Structure 1
Amino acid sequence: MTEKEKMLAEKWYDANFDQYLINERARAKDICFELNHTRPSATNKRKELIDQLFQTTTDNVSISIPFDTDYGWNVKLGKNVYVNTNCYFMDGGQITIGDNVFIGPNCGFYTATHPLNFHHRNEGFEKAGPIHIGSNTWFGGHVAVLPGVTIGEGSVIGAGSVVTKDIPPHSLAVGNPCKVVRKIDNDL
């Protein structure tokens, strides 16, 4: 297997020295840099850059600068996704975002695990754990979501939360660590 293949298979992979991955990270970083230095009212140029970054034709994905991502093509986005300032989609592990998702400022979605043993870590190995963000969700600012975590559809995550475990659908959840407070009635 190539290191990309290992990355996408939740296997340990040589994140630091593999050339294809190094190149892809460089591509995304330079696109982010361009985006981050594009005037917010330059609507068409921003759309172009975002679509280039995510390698897709987005539908009402609004990104408030600055923004960061590692690969870009490993963020799968629904329509009507509102990303406020200074978010980071660390997407070695796929980050899947549904439709109608409100992401507050300074949110970090982290899919990278490093080894606990520093000898292995120092060699550059990582393991990627995908993040699944359901449709119809709202994240407050300053939220961090950890590798492998799923946040169910219709759920609301309070500001400051550190989401270390899966959050069921239609739930209000807050805290560090993030814990369900109660259910949300999402009926029409």
Structure 2
Amino acid sequence: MSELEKMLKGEHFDGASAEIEALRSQAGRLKLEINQSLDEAERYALQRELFGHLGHKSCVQPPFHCEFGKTIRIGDHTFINMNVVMLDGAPITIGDHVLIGPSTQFYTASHSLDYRRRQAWETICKPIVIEDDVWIGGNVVINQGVTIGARSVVAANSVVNQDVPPDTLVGGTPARILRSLKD
């Protein structure tokens, strides 16, 4: 098993592995051009090379930050605001009609509580999934292995450690259910 594939699969891996490093450069180069670009069509085009998928009529405002990019998939009519950071060692999958606030963070990557197990920067990545019609506010942290339920809202500055059921407003750190949005 490739170190790359180990990373995507939530197992231990070497980050200096070559195919991974290359992915990382591809990503570095693209961020810089996208981020320094004033042509809207030019940014979208380069994002189709940066991202795993970028859907129709979706927008991702610069500056946008990520580590690998190809792991990220964005559906249709989806909008991501400025200054978003995604640690994308594992797949990040984003639905349709999703809104994401500024300075929001997606961290697939994580570490062990035991310092003896972090001395080689050992990391595990688990995927994040944002379902359709979700609204994530600004300055939010969504941690690894979380799924956000459809038609749900995450309040500004929340930290989401666990799944968010659908049709729901949640808030805080860690996030809690504030109200049901179901009819």
The normalised TM-score by structure 1 is 0.92
| Structure 2 residue aligned with 1:30 | 29
Q: CA deviation at 1:55?
A: 4.3
State the secondary structure of the residue aligned to 1:132.
Answer: strand
Unaligned runs of 5+ in 1: none
The offset of 1:115, in angstroms, is: 2.7
CA distance in structure 2 between the aligned counterparts of 1:31 and 1:67, rounded to whole angstroms: 10
Structure 1 residues 55 and 98, CA gap change in structure 2 (3 angstroms)? closer
What residue number does 1:7 align with? 7
CA distance in 1, matches of 2:122, 2:14: 5
Which residue of structure 2 aligns with residue 166 of structure 1? 163
Map 1:117-156 onto structure 2 (within 5 A).
Answer: 117-156=114-153
CA distance in structure 2 between the partners assigned to 1:34 and 1:116 by the alignment: 37
Q: Are the equivalent residues in 2 in contact too, given 1:29–1:68 (CA < 8 A)?
A: no
Residue identity over aligned pairs, in percent, reads: 35
The residue matched to 1:142 in structure 2 has which SS?
A: coil
Q: Judge conservation of contact 1:94–1:129 (CA < 8 Å) in 2.
A: yes
After superposition, what is the alpha-carbon deviation per residue over 1:52-103, rounded to whole angstroms, capped at 9, x for unaligned?
A: 1114453122011100111111011111110111001211111010000000
Instruction: For residues 132-179 of structure 1, give each alpha carbon's deviation from its aligned partner in whole angstroms, at most 9, with x where no partner exists.
Output: 111100011000000111110110000010101110011010111111
Q: Can you give the 5+ residue segments of structure 2 that lack an aligned partner in the other structure?
A: none
Residue type matched to 1:158 in 2? A
Counterpart among 55, 58, 63 of residue 61 in structure 1: 58
Find out whether 1:102 has 2:99 as its counterpart: yes
- Counterpart of 1:45 (choices 33, 42, 49) is 42
- State the Cα distance separating 1:131 from its structure 2 match: 0.4
The offset of 1:13, in angstroms, is 1.4
1:58 and 1:139 map into 2 onto residues whose CA distance is: 18
Native 8 Å contact 1:14 1:126 kept in 2: no
Q: Report whether the alignment pairs 1:82 with 2:79.
A: yes
Q: Using the alignment, how far apart are the partners of 1:35 and 1:74 within structure 2?
A: 17
Query: Do the aligned partners of 2:94 and 2:132 also contact (CA within 8 Å) in 1?
Result: yes
- In 2: Cα distance, 1:185 partner to 1:114 partner: 36
Deviation for aligned residue 1:45? 0.8
